[PDB]
Structure formats: structure tokens, C-alpha cells
Amino acid sequence: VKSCKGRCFERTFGNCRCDAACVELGNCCLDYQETCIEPEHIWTCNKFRCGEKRLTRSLCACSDDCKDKGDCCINYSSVCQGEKSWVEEPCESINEPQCPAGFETPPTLLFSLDGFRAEYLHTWGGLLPVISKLKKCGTYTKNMRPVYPTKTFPNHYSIVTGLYPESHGIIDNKMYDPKMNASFSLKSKEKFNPEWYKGEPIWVTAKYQGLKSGTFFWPGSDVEINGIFPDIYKMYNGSVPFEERILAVLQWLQLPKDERPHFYTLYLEEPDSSGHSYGPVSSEVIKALQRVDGMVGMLMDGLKELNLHRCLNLILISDHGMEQGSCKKYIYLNKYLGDVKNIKVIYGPAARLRPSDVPDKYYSFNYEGIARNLSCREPNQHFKPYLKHFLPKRLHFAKSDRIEPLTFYLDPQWQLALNPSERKYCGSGFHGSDNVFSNMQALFVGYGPGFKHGIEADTFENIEVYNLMCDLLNLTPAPNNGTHGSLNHLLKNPVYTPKHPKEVHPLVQCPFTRNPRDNLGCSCNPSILPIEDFQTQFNLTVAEEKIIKHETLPYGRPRVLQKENTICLLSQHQFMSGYSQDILMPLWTSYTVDRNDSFSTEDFSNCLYQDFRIPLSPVHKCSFYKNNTKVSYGFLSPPQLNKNSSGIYSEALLTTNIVPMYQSFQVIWRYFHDTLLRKYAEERNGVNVVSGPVFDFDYDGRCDSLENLRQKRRVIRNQEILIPTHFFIVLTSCKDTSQTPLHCENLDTLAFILPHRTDNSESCVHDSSWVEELLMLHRARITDVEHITGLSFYQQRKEPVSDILKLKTHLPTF
Ligand SMILES: *[C@@H]1O[C@H](CO)[C@@H](O[C@@H]2O[C@H](CO)[C@@H](O[C@@H]3O[C@H](CO)[C@@H](O)[C@H](O)[C@@H]3O)[C@H](O)[C@H]2NC(C)=O)[C@H](O)[C@H]1NC(C)=O
Ligand SMILES: *[C@@H]1O[C@H](CO)[C@@H](O[C@@H]2O[C@H](CO)[C@@H](O[C@H]3O[C@H](CO)[C@@H](O)[C@H](O)[C@@H]3O)[C@H](O)[C@H]2NC(C)=O)[C@H](O)[C@H]1NC(C)=O
Ligand SMILES: *[C@@H]1O[C@H](CO)[C@@H](O)[C@H](O)[C@H]1NC(C)=O
Ligand SMILES: *[C@@H]1O[C@H](CO)[C@@H](O)[C@H](O)[C@H]1NC(C)=O
Ligand SMILES: *[C@@H]1O[C@H](CO)[C@@H](O)[C@H](O)[C@H]1NC(C)=O
């Protein structure tokens, strides 16, 4: 016979050898390698191995006795008995789980493919049959938004805590904490120091509530967090073959019920490693993608053999995407600063700057000096210096002391360093950029009894996944930055029903009080028809008010969730508002721009009308602002918008509809209300607008207390004034343009948190087309606005709460 089957390593008579010497003599049987050697180095059966005489040094068996001795290769039944593999079976729905005793609550496995950009599945899906089937049979989104910076430790730790890096403390793999005077490195023993890891990873949450955990690698799983390790964890060793990681998890799923985990993790270094080395569009990445596709297949086949393929909930995920770097698209700061030796620059697309003399000069150092030094130096400059607190609030990258006070925002494909010596190869693949860039977006597929089948969900953020995993494991989540219930649409049977938050103190009233018509110091433009009988013009019939309320608060009035705060509803013909006596300012106005409404070019500067519903105050007078070089004022509900006349809406000039405003910000505000709002109103057939001030002096993304606000007032012309840190805008139309904002089945929303700064250095003015770009950069989720104002919107919409949460957590795209 001319085959080695049955005779591996036996000396033979029959002119065809099966011993190691044959190779040198070139007289091996044609199947010698496949039959006798390959089995020492592979985890697969194949037509050469089916019914093999058992070899002692094989990793797994394809011998006839393999099912009895329980060590068949995972693909044994597919290849050697002609059964179908998991990927070959058509989708079938999992309406009831089929689990062994112990899994009354089914297990969840969090499977991470490092650096798997969402685009890889968009484009190479036809080369990835297993992940493609998981998508087809499961719950998929085209894009999961990672956290900023779009790096590995921060995103993995974010996924298992539901926290932004600014709150969980792992902002990068290399950090300096000044209050600890220590440095974090993965090569150091500081990696194991629990001082670094804030929040509560899901394996900790689980342990407190009775469930055990098995992590085969994950950031934090090798650290004693709140005094807890996972019940099973592995010391990181990237050289462990992917197959052995998957086989280990399959061994864990066969432990007896008393010691068998409910929560599992699996981490693979591909395709991040190949992406860095060869670029995201490369033969090496295609091969890496096909390899990880096969490892997912190996898991699914393994689960089928254990009859757990209709039991386990699989979350297939990645931390971040991958971009093509270029030596032509790297910025070196030494060009503008020279070979200075006193600063450390964290290089890459998420570049940060710090003094070398730490912790001594960390707070005293002249950040603003370098910030101004590096601003608007070139035309079409590809980087932008920001003091952390001036970065867009959507990035939630400021609160932590481990975030260097000076950061850089870089354009897509662009990185930054001090000089070419202090960086790795410029032409490599890279990640770290803004978390809304296409190529940074991440993988998400959910498959199992808990998840819906054949569903394509809209973009959601990875900070939402912790709550989802808690629901899948019947866990009460630790407090986190996800909006519990926003991902209920992914689940067959949601376990948490969200409720709209309750107003703590009921709305105070601001009654009309007869008082003297005073001089406010105004040189009003003649065209404006004043309010000559206030009490006449503002004594409204219930019918008249119902009409006004229906037109201006179609979604309900914003509700205040702040504890010690007293607001009152002020009514007008074209807008409503919530006024704060404590801060002498409205917290919010609400109005509606209709398609065919008039915007006036008529000047309305130095013109205010007194509101008799509140006490007159110095800071409500035109005179307080007349030739004032510290602060000016602006209107929330815009006087340029008339429904009745073609002139100026006089009621909009009330003292109660003004906010402190820097003259530089007036350009942005004036351009928005004169030009943009008109274009938006036409494009969307009407726009409901809610605008207001924001006080975030703590730069923690949260509305500050009344108590803390008292101490942040500035003294200008011997008066106490509170100057907003930001202004928020929330635009609301219908998805269907045919209908107007008052009659929408489905809301289309767009929100901004615009920074309130004394100059427009951020936009490098040198055509106001830059105002559009600044609005886009400072876009926010309605949830972001809610958190930073203490307000809660759309509480009167007839939609279920979970659907409203989905809408509020949405970030807009352009
Ligand atoms: C993201 O979610 C986390 C947790 O839900 C939020 O972080 C937490 O922020 C609160 C308020 O700043 C912190 O509480 C406080 O502790 C200090 C120090 O003892 C105390 O003086 C205060 O009175 C208050 O009780 C809490 O420590 C903190 N937790 C963590 C893990 O950082 C964060 O606010 C959320 N971020 C956003 C933007 O919603
Ligand atoms: C990290 O994981 C590595 C890959 O899984 C692993 O490397 C391997 O270690 C085995 C034994 O632990 C080596 O095998 C040699 O030792 C056996 C045992 O007696 C001897 O019979 C043989 O001489 C055999 O050569 C493998 O050579 C080695 N595999 C690879 C690919 O390197 C390490 O143990 C793990 N730990 C660290 C931190 O590196
Ligand atoms: C801080 O660490 C530095 C070295 O990193 C050390 O020389 C110094 O003694 C430490 N303590 C302080 C508070 O400066
Ligand atoms: C910025 O400061 C550096 C020193 O770090 C200096 O070389 C350069 O002249 C300054 N650039 C200016 C004033 O824009
Ligand atoms: C005050 O008036 C002076 C004189 O024209 C002018 O230079 C200055 O800009 C004015 N300041 C403000 C902010 O109105």
C-alpha cells in the first residue's frame, strides 16, 4: 500500500516509508506529513485523519474511539461523520433557552477581537462566513461607538464597567497620576496596583450577587478590584495560541454547576496586531480576519457539541477601529517650540502635554501659554490645542487628574509628537482618534436566547453594554454612564422597565406685580412697538394658553431634577420659559420655528422691556451692559423671529429672556439665529427649539449645585453675575418632513453644547462657515444636555420610556 494510515513510525517492507528518515531520502508515502506529523501541530480533523490509529503526541484525536475517550477535535463530527458545522446550519430562533441545571440564568460570554474596525465586516463580510452568520441570525449594529481615546485598555475597561475613562481611571496604557506621584505602564508592577482601576467591573458586580466568572484575558481581570479576582482568570501571555484559549473556555463550561462561571471573557490580539504592522487594507489583515472568523467558528462548533449553542449568550465585540498612518500626516511640535527639554508629549492622535518637572510644576505650569503659542499657526492646520475643559463634552475627557491639562484634537489620519525620535513608525496602522471617526467604529454582534434574531440596531455606545450584560445575567448594575433601558430593543424579554425621572419640587409661580415703569438705559430702535399695557398683554385666557402650550411645548415642558432650585413658568405668545430667581436667568426657553416664518434684519441692540412678573435688578438693565468690556447679553428666544408682523417680536425683548454673553460668542449666536435656524426650519418643515445656559465649572459633565454656583459668580460694575460655561440647543423635527414638529410619529433630534469663551481662537477666524463646523464638533446626545443642565425632555411623548431613552442617547452624524 502507498499510504501511512495505520503504520506511522513503523519500519516497512513495501517501498514507501513512514519514519522520520524517509524525508532526507525523499521516499516518504505521499500522505506521511498529513497522517503522522501535522497532528502534533493542528486542532482539526481532515480526510487523512478520519479513523486514524491514535498517535500519542497529537493535540486532539480523530480515531474511532475519540468520542468514547472524549478528546475528538471540535470539527470531528462535521468532517468525519458528515454532520453539519454550526455555520452550515440555517438560522433558527431561540425563543426558550435549552440549558443544563445551573443555567436557569444562561451564561454570557464577552468575546473581543482587538482592533476589529466595523468597516472590516462591511467590506470583507463575504470572506467571514461565521461572523456574517452571527450577524444574520443575531442582533447587529453597523457601528458601535468606542470611548475616547480610542485605545485598548480604556475601551476594554469601559465595556465591563459602563464608565467613561475619565471616571474609571484607565485613560491610556501609559499614565501619570500627580496625587499618587506614580506612573502606570503594562511592563511595570503598577499594572497590578488597584489604585488605578476605579468603578466596578461586571465580574465584581456578579460575585456580590452570587455568580462566578471565568476571564481568559481582559484588562483588570488580573487585578484585585474591591478585593476581588474573577473565580478563574489567566495571567496575560499573548503567545498562548487562540485555539487553547477557546478550548479552556469550553472546559470551564463543563465544570460541575457549583464551580462553573456564568460570566466569561475571551480576548484575541487580532486583527489589531496585523492592522498596526501591515495597515488596515493589507493581505495580512485579510488573513488575520479569516483566522479570527475561524476561531469564532471553533467556539460555536464547541458549544454545539456541548449542546450549549441554544443556551449561551455571545457578545462578539471590539475595543476600537484602525486607520492608515502616514509619515506625511505626522506633526512635530519642535517645529513651533524648538528642542525644549522641560515638557513630556504623549504622542499619537490623542496627544497630550505635561511638564517634565512633576508633581511640583503639574498645576503651576503655563498650559495656556503653549496653547496660545500653538493656535492658528498654519492655514488648514491638522491639529488643535485644547485645555481639557474646552474639549467637546461628547468626548467626556476632562474630570480625571490623570488627563494632562493640555490635550490635542487631531484631524482624521493625523498624529502628533514632540519630535521624530519620540514616536514609533509613522507609516504603521494606528487608532486613538475622535470616537465619531468612521474607521474608529467597533464590532458588535449579540447571539443567543437573550438577543433578538435578524435585527440591525442603530449605532449605540459601548458604555451601554455593561447594563445589557447585567440584564442578561439578572444583575442590578453598579452606577455607570449607560442609560439603563436604552438597549431594551436588542433583547427578546427586557428585565428592566425604565421610568421618566420625577420632578422633586413642584413649579413655583411668578405673578404680575404693579410697579413703576423704570428707565433701563435703552436707546430702542424706533421700529420696535413697545409693550404699553403689560397687564393687558399678559392676562391670557385658559383657551389662549392651551393654544400657546400646544405650539411651544408639544413634547411637554422640560422638568427640573435639581434638589434645592426654584423655577417658575413664564408665558409669551411665541415661546415659554423656566426662570431661575436664584441665578437671575432662564434655565430654558422653548419655541417652534414654522417653515414659512419671517426672520428680521432690523437691529434690536440696546433695547430691553421690563418684565413686571419678576423684580427689576441692575443686571436686567441695558445700562449694566452699555459699553461693558467684561460681559454683554443675548436672548434665548430670538427677537428676530416674528409670526404676526415682518418686524421684531417685542415680547422677546423682556428682561427675563436674556443671559450673560461674551461679545465673541455673540457672532456664533447671531449667525445661528439669523442664517442656520432659517435653513434648518425650511429643510425639516418646522423645528421645535429648546435653548439655555450651562454651568459646568467642575468640567465633570454635570450641572453644578446652587451652593457651588454662589461661589463662581463674577463681580462686574459692583454686581454679582453668573456667566455660563456653555449654551445648549436642542432642535426637534419629525423623521417624516411631510408632518410638522407638532404632529410627529417619530422625532428627529439634534443637540449642541457650545462652549462660552471670551475669544473665537478655537475656530481660527481669518464667510462664517466656521460656525457650522464648531456646531458639528460640539454636537451632543440629548442625554449629555440632560446630565449637564439637570433637565429632562420629552416626558409627555406617548412612546414607551425605553424608546425615548434610545432617542436621547443618540449622537447625530453628518
Ligand atoms: C458617570 O457615572 C459615574 C458613576 O455613576 C459618575 O461618577 C461619580 O460622580 C459622583 C459625582 O461627582 C461622585 O460622587 C461623589 O463622591 C465625592 C467624593 O467622596 C463626594 O464628595 C461627592 O459628594 C459625591 O458623593 C462619584 O465618586 C463618581 N464615581 C466614580 C466611579 O467616578 C459620573 O458623574 C458619571 N458621568 C457623567 C458624565 O454622567
Ligand atoms: C506563554 O505561552 C507560551 C505558548 O503557549 C508557552 O510556551 C511554551 O511552553 C511549552 C512548555 O510550557 C514549551 O514546550 C517545551 O517543554 C516541554 C515540557 O517538558 C518539553 O517536553 C519540550 O522541550 C518542549 O519544547 C513550548 O516550546 C513553548 N511554546 C512556544 C510556542 O513557545 C509559555 O510556557 C508561556 N509562558 C511564558 C510566560 O512565556
Ligand atoms: C515623586 O516621584 C519622584 C520620582 O518619580 C521622586 O524623585 C520624588 O521623591 C517623589 N515625591 C515627591 C512628592 O516629589
Ligand atoms: C513659543 O514658545 C517657544 C518656546 O517653547 C518659542 O520657541 C517660540 O518662539 C514661541 N512661539 C510663539 C511666540 O508663537
Ligand atoms: C466703548 O467705547 C469705546 C469708544 O468707541 C470703544 O473703543 C469700545 O470698544 C467700547 N466698548 C464696548 C465693548 O462697547
Residue numbers in the entry: 105 to 870, 874 to 921
What text appears in the publication on this structure?
ENPP1 has a role in purin­ergic signalling through the hydrolysis of nucleotide triphosphates (NTPs) and cyclic nucleotides (cNMPs) to their corresponding nucleotide monophosphates (NMPs). Apart from viral poxins, ENPP1 is the only known hydrolase of cyclic GMP-AMP (cGAMP), which is a second messenger generated by cyclic GMP-AMP synthase (cGAS) as an innate immune-system response to double-stranded DNA in the cytosol.
We have determined the apo structure as well as several structures co-crystallized with natural products, natural product analogues and small-molecule inhibitors. The apo structure has only a single Zn atom in both the A and B protomers. Additional zinc was added to the gel-filtration protocol as we found that one of the two Zn atoms in the active site was either missing or not fully occupied. Asn277 adopts two distinct conformations, whereas Leu290 has a single conformer that moves slightly to accommodate bound compounds.
